[PDB]
Amino acid sequence: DIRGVLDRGPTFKPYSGTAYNALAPKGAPNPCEWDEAQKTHVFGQAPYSGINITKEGIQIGVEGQTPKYADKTFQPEPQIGESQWYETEINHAAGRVLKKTTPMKPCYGSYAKPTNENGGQGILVKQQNGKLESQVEMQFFSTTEATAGNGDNLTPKVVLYSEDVDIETPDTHISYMPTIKEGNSRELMGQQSMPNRPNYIAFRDNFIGLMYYNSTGNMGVLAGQASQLNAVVDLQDRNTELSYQLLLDSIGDRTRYFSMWNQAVDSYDPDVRII
Amino acid sequence: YMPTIKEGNSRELMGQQSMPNRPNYIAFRDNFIGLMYYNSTGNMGVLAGQ
Amino acid sequence: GYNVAQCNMTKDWFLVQMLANYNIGYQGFYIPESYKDRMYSFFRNFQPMSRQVVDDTKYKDYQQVGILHQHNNSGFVGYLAPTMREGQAYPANFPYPLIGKTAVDSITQKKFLCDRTLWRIPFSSNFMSMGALTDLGQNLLYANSAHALD
Amino acid sequence: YMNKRVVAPGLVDCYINLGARWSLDYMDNVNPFNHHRNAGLRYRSMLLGNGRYVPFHIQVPQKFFAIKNLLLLPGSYTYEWNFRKDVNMVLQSSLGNDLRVDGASIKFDSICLYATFFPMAHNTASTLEAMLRNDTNDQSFNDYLSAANMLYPIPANATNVPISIPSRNWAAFRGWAFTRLKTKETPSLGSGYDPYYTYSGSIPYLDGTFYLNHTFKKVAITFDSSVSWPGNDRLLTPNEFEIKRSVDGEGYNVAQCNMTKDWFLVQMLANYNIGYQGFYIPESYKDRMYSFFRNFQPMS
Amino acid sequence: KTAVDSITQKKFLCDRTLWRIPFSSNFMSMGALTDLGQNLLYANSAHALDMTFEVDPMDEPTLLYVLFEVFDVVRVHRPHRGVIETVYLRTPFSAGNA
Amino acid sequence: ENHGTEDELPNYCFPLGGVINTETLTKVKPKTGQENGWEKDATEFSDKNEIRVGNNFAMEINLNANLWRNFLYSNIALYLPDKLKYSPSNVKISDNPNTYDYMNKRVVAPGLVDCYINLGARWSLDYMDNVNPFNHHRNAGLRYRSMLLGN
Amino acid sequence: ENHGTEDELPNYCFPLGGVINTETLTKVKPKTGQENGWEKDATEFSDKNEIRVGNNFAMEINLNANLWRNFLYSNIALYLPDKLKYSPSNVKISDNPNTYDYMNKRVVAPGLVDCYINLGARWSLDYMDNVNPFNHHRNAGLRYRSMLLGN
Numbered sequence A: 001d002i003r004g005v006l007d008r009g010p011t012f013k014p015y016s017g018t019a020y021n022a023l024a025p026k027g028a029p030n031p032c033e034w035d036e037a038q039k040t041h042v043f044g045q046a047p048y049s050g051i052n053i054t055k056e057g058i059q060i061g062v063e064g065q066t067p068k069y070a071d072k073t074f075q076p077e078p079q080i081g082e083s084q085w086y087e088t089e090i091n092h093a094a095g096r097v098l099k100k101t102t103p104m105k106p107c108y109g110s111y112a113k114p115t116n117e118n119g120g121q122g123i124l125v126k127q128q129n130g131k132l133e134s135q136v137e138m139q140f141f142s143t144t145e146a147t148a149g150n151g152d153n154l155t156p157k158v159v160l161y162s163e164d165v166d167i168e169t170p171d172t173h174i175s176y177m178p179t180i181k182e183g184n185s186r187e188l189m190g191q192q193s194m195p196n197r198p199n200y201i202a203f204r205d206n207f208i209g210l211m212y213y214n215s216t217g218n219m220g221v222l223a224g225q226a227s228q229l230n231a232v233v234d235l236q237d238r239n240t241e242l243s244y245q246l247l248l249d250s251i252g253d254r255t256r257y258f259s260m261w262n263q264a265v266d267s268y269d270p271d272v273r274i275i
Numbered sequence B: 001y002m003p004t005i006k007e008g009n010s011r012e013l014m015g016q017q018s019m020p021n022r023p024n025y026i027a028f029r030d031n032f033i034g035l036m037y038y039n040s041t042g043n044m045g046v047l048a049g050q
Numbered sequence C: 001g002y003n004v005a006q007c008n009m010t011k012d013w014f015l016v017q018m019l020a021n022y023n024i025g026y027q028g029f030y031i032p033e034s035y036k037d038r039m040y041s042f043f044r045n046f047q048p049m050s051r052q053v054v055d056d057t058k059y060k061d062y063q064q065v066g067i068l069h070q071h072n073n074s075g076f077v078g079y080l081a082p083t084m085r086e087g088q089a090y091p092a093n094f095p096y097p098l099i100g101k102t103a104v105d106s107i108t109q110k111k112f113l114c115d116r117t118l119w120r121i122p123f124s125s126n127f128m129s130m131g132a133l134t135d136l137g138q139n140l141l142y143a144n145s146a147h148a149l150d
Numbered sequence D: 001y002m003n004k005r006v007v008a009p010g011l012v013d014c015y016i017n018l019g020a021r022w023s024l025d026y027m028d029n030v031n032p033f034n035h036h037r038n039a040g041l042r043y044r045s046m047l048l049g050n051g052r053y054v055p056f057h058i059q060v061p062q063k064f065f066a067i068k069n070l071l072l073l074p075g076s077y078t079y080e081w082n083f084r085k086d087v088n089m090v091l092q093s094s095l096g097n098d099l100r101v102d103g104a105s106i107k108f109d110s111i112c113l114y115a116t117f118f119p120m121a122h123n124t125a126s127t128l129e130a131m132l133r134n135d136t137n138d139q140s141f142n143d144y145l146s147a148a149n150m151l152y153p154i155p156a157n158a159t160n161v162p163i164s165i166p167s168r169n170w171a172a173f174r175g176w177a178f179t180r181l182k183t184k185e186t187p188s189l190g191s192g193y194d195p196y197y198t199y200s201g202s203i204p205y206l207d208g209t210f211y212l213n214h215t216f217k218k219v220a221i222t223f224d225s226s227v228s229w230p231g232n233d234r235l236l237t238p239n240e241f242e243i244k245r246s247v248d249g250e251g252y253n254v255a256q257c258n259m260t261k262d263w264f265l266v267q268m269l270a271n272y273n274i275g276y277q278g279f280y281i282p283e284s285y286k287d288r289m290y291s292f293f294r295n296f297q298p299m300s
Numbered sequence E: 001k002t003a004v005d006s007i008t009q010k011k012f013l014c015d016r017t018l019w020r021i022p023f024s025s026n027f028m029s030m031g032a033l034t035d036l037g038q039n040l041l042y043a044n045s046a047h048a049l050d051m052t053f054e055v056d057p058m059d060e061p062t063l064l065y066v067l068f069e070v071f072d073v074v075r076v077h078r079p080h081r082g083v084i085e086t087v088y089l090r091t092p093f094s095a096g097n098a
Numbered sequence F, G: 001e002n003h004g005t006e007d008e009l010p011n012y013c014f015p016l017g018g019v020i021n022t023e024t025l026t027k028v029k030p031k032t033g034q035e036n037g038w039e040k041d042a043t044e045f046s047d048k049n050e051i052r053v054g055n056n057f058a059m060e061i062n063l064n065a066n067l068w069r070n071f072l073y074s075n076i077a078l079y080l081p082d083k084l085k086y087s088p089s090n091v092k093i094s095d096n097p098n099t100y101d102y103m104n105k106r107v108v109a110p111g112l113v114d115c116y117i118n119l120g121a122r123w124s125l126d127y128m129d130n131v132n133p134f135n136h137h138r139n140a141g142l143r144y145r146s147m148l149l150g151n
């Protein structure tokens, strides 16, 4: 009987494909925003329907007569939108986006640790006064043409929240880098991602190699207690292993598997080798 | 998804969606279990000489 | 460490079942022959299962995310319903990665599964099936006296 | 290196060898047991669980033949054994990445031993002991494989390999059995540990998976510089066995394969004593998994 | 109706298995101890051996793995309490100086 | 046998970039002092920012139904008694009813056999009872014999 | 036994006519005896021809993921214990927790089970251990018996 601690390594990938927004097309970029020349451009989206915007925020509900506004930590949720399919009029949409600090990656296989029970993600920082707090900003947009007129209204139409999250790809790699120029730039949006190859790891069949065999350097000993006369003699040109193998083969059916001895048989697929 | 709560016909609707019903089989059991009484003093079977 | 077969079962019960259904075990273990192992037997219907899961305490960033805020496949499928698609795109938040260079400390859970069979316990002196009757069924101590069962 | 490289899908697309039961060339000499569809391998990997950090608890059987089934008798004895810790040996991969570099590890906490007895009646046990002690009732044991094993190097692009055996008695022989192995794959035993060895496929020389037997050409045997065993003018080509022919001008191939008749005949005989009364598919029981006829594949 | 002129290629695969060669006068498995061994015992002689292998070429170092099927047995004797003696024997290729 | 198809979900597609019908817009900042004020900021944010509103484009498809349809069709259809086909229109055809051409250029309407034939019932079609089921195209033995000779 | 899916290649559905987005153009020929320069030639060519510049437009999908997702939702999720489902909105359902209607018109969030659960680990869900795995719609024997009486 053996008990112990095993660390399979940082390259243990037992599944085909990846497990993060697998449905997403293999080219669609995340809502991002980058720098050019010397200004800033934004690529974004806004699925949520609102009611009325203000410099204070975006209305979500009504408590009595006081308007209610979204919590900047986790609203609006990215997976909430209008259900009706036939398009209609909307005037107070909102969305989320990542600031230029965090590097850009495709939507394929994109992860970010949640940082509050509500479910939002956002890099906490240590506030100047001893505490921890988030840092989000709000941006407002109105129609272009609607800027060729007195500020008679200029009412903002679309609201974005900007964020920064520690994105990382745990299982996929870039399959196309258009240009070696590092940093955030307009080129990088052409990149595409591919999942890593599957890769298993385990104990061998019947635990081959776990215990020493056929080596006078470390031969095992079974003996009478007082006599201390070795009862086992081993030679080094006898491969004990191909042995258990074929013997098991015969005196039974290897096709089946058993757990107690980890009894399983290495075997390929009959339709891979021959096409 | 029934966008509204009223009835008749109203733009409101024309936006619904449909969904198939779950499958459901019904037939006799294996070896007709329960088709003949057993171990029931109310309905003991009889095989005897006339 | 009384667990065996890499399941959550003690050795003794495994031995008892193997004996009571195959007279096998006093001389090792192996795979019983097919014709001695019918459909409702023990061995054919024994499946051990095990997994790893995130550790609530030892990991210091554990955050219980309810169902109402798991936004994997954010903008490409409905919300808490099989209905039409919605939502925008945005990196996800679930589930934690158990692999790769940034794995999170985990714990293990094991169990087994067994069906189409009832647990059997033979009334022998040493549990070995040795005939349509038993030795213990004939000894006077249990055959010429009275007893209560608990 | 094996995960970031890339290969154009034009090599093998839906317009390759159409309608032909055939296998690609470069794939023949690459072991197919290194894959992600080895049902045994995926079973064994899943059985530990999908995580990365695992406490494990196993029981390892004893396999030495000389003490496999020996019936011990009362008294005290000492039992001492060893175990490896080299992560690259005990662990099996699916690609061939040397796990030492990648940084896998294993550690042992405690070892325990178990044993089972029989509640046999005491007087009967004593009688059985005494009877078993008389020297006319010793214990005999024979290994299953029971052969001598030799390895000979073969350099790159070689075509000929001669081997020699100095003069010796040959009482009670049984015969030959050969196969081939791909260097970088085979390990190098004989010491506590080795380096200079990176890979992880499926040690073939040590488990069964064998996969290049599709490329030998001819084997010749001589005794004392004059005898062409088995001689006495039996085979189609008396001097030696020629397994597969490249160019045939006389029709010596069978089963539409490129294998000479004689080799088929010899293999059938030595497997099932079948062939002096025609041919026919051997029954299941006399043809186990590792048999010959189970693993015969002709392609064209 | 516009096919090109073609040639054919044939081959075979036999993974998982070992070519073998029995030692008899008829290649038939007629028992554990084949006749030719007994006949050599009759002769009471000694001889040398040569073998030659010709293989397909490969662009990689390789090994040739050869098994000589032989006899090998162990007999175990237990005279007293808490003692055990054993005798090995492997033929033809023996291993002991006594 | 016909249990229908398991298609209780949609398989919408999407556009290559995830968004195509985007719309331009411009930065808006709250005017200082007076409340509800607004004005334009063009110092840092570029004049033109592309943004989508609402959901994104997508095209629906039903997979399992298509797979089944295709199959049933193929097989059972293109093998019903001839009394159920009809010649093509304004295309050259053969006249001998036993050649390759005649068996190839004939056409047969899928409506005869589709994914709604005697649903939930284990059954075989009457027209096929008196037609050889070995002259099909899955005689694994026939396929093997054809392959072994070559392609 | 969730191995994941093989989706290393994309699957693109193309427009029906090959291309759709296209501009018009006009014939041009070199102007002789000038080392450069060009002139219109509508003598024998239409002055307005169709041409598309760049790669054609086509939408993407992911197949194996969707198939596996449909299978998981269809054959597992619906059978979860009633305690985890929730009532629908604005639809009448019966009160008896046993009738066919009440089971049919309930609804269960697909997010509970999808292709991102227990990846790589052969495992059975705790909520399903104590649910009978025999009252099920893929049970071969029961299906056979139901068919055998017709449909």
Ligand SMILES: [Ca+2]
Binding pocket: G022, G023, G024, G025
């Ligand atoms: Ca134009």
